[PDB]
Amino acid sequence: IWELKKDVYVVELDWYPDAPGEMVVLTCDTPEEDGITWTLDQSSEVLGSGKTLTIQVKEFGDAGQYTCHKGGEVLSHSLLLLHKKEDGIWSTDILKDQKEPKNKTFLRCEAKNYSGRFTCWWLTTISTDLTFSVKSSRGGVTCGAATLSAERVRGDNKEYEYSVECQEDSACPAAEESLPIEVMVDAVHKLKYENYTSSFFIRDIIKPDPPKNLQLKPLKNSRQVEVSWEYPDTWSTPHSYFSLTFCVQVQGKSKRRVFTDKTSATVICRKNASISVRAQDRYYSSSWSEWASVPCS
Ligand SMILES: *[C@@H]1O[C@H](CO)[C@@H](O[C@@H]2O[C@H](CO)[C@@H](O[C@@H]3O[C@H](CO)[C@@H](O)[C@H](O)[C@@H]3O)[C@H](O)[C@H]2NC(C)=O)[C@H](O)[C@H]1NC(C)=O
Ligand SMILES: *Sc1ccc([N+](=O)[O-])c(C(=O)O)c1
Ligand SMILES: *Sc1ccc([N+](=O)[O-])c(C(=O)O)c1
């Protein structure tokens, strides 16, 4: 048993029927010795008396808000959450595996520039009685609260998307990163305690916003057209240091590529086709932005 936060404790259990469990001794945080009584959750049943209470924690029934009373008053609480360890590996019932980069990815982090600011997201089937706590650091990072940012429909069930925004306290955009950023997330659903983590350098999780103000300018006595665009607003300043490279593609009806560092390109439009442009950090091979498109008709 260990303290997660003030008056909240986690008990690590090997998860299988009739597991021995853990002998847990709760001590009431009161200096009074007389008339102490003990209760679990909403039940009125006295489990014992005295300053100490011993329980065998073997299942969720033994977990909960243990309360010590004196003269009808509440003296202290000891909230017991469990951390199930099924077949040698900690449970992951709360968050869905996003499966995107390479399996067992529950936390997905992304940055839009080098400001030291980033966003992490996760998905759950659970709609309430669910709390999250996010902490982050390099190897001084401040994170806001995990907020509900999207609600979707996946088959029979519902999918809730949570996101958190963090900022490195004393960022330095242009500097080389020697130590990666670490995100730690605690997940509590009723009485189930879970643990999640992610390690990355800002440079690797970068994905700029798409090129903006895409324009198509036809040319006289030419089959070709000129497409032009601008750097996105959220991208890092100045562009001279933090430059972007681009890729142009003509997306037609068929489903069976030009690279440039410029904000313009000359291409051939065709009926029913669209011109598409993506961006990548010129100097680091991170994620390509989402497409910005302009149609040919
Ligand atoms: C994510 O979950 C894991 C596993 O439940 C957490 O690891 C556990 O962390 C606690 C807190 O530091 C460790 O407890 C300490 O154990 C020593 C004796 O071994 C004791 O002297 C300390 O007072 C305290 O009780 C616990 O051993 C450790 N479990 C394992 C198997 O390593 C981990 O901390 C969680 N991540 C978080 C909340 O950041
Ligand atoms: S890029 C950068 C900004 C601020 C500071 N700072 O003096 O705290 C540094 C730095 O000197 O570490 C770098
Ligand atoms: S023009 C272009 C650049 C990058 C990528 N990409 O996302 O790997 C594509 C593409 O394959 O869609 C096209």
From Swiss-Prot:
Protein family: Belongs to the IL-12B family.
PANTHER family named in the record: INTERLEUKIN-12 SUBUNIT BETA (PTHR48485:SF4), INTERLEUKIN-12 SUBUNIT BETA-RELATED (PTHR48485)
Single GO cellular component term: extracellular region
SUPFAM superfamilies in the cross-refs: Fibronectin type III, Immunoglobulin
UniProt-recorded name of the protein: Interleukin-12 subunit beta
Post-translational modification: Known to be C-mannosylated in the recombinant protein; it is not yet known for sure if the wild-type protein is also modified.
Quaternary structure note: Heterodimer with IL12A; disulfide-linked. The heterodimer is known as interleukin IL-12. Heterodimer with IL23A; disulfide-linked. The heterodimer is known as interleukin IL-23. Also secreted as a monomer. Interacts with NBR1; this interaction promotes IL-12 secretion.
Disulfide bonds: 28-68, 109-120, 143-166, 269-296
Function: Cytokine that can act as a growth factor for activated T and NK cells, enhance the lytic activity of NK/lymphokine-activated killer cells, and stimulate the production of IFN-gamma by resting PBMC. Associates with IL23A to form the IL-23 interleukin, a heterodimeric cytokine which functions in innate and adaptive immunity. IL-23 may constitute with IL-17 an acute response to infection in peripheral tissues. IL-23 binds to a heterodimeric receptor complex composed of IL12RB1 and IL23R, activates the Jak-Stat signaling cascade, stimulates memory rather than naive T-cells and promotes production of pro-inflammatory cytokines. IL-23 induces autoimmune inflammation and thus may be responsible for autoimmune inflammatory diseases and may be important for tumorigenesis.
UniProt cross-references to Pfam families, sorted A to Z: IL12p40_C (PF10420)
Gene Ontology MF terms in the entry: cytokine activity; cytokine receptor activity; identical protein binding; interleukin-12 alpha subunit binding; interleukin-12 receptor binding; protein heterodimerization activity; protein-containing complex binding
PROSITE patterns to which the protein is assigned, alphabetical: FN3, HEMATOPO_REC_L_F3, IG_LIKE
Domain Fibronectin type-III positions: 210-297
Organism field: Homo sapiens (Human)
Record-level GO BP terms: cell migration; cell surface receptor signaling pathway via JAK-STAT; cellular response to lipopolysaccharide; cellular response to type II interferon; defense response to Gram-negative bacterium; defense response to protozoan; defense response to virus; interleukin-12-mediated signaling pathway
Glycan-linked positions: 113, 195, 288
Keyword Secreted: yes
Ig-like C2-type domain segment(s): 1-84
Chief location: secreted
Nucleotide-binding among keywords: no
Subcellular location: Secreted
InterPro entries in alphabetical order: FN3_dom, FN3_sf, Hematopoietin_rcpt_L_F3_CS, Ig-like_dom, Ig-like_dom_sf, Ig-like_fold, Ig_sub2, IL-12
Swiss-Prot/TrEMBL keywords: Cytokine, Disulfide bond, Glycoprotein, Immunoglobulin domain, Secreted, Signal
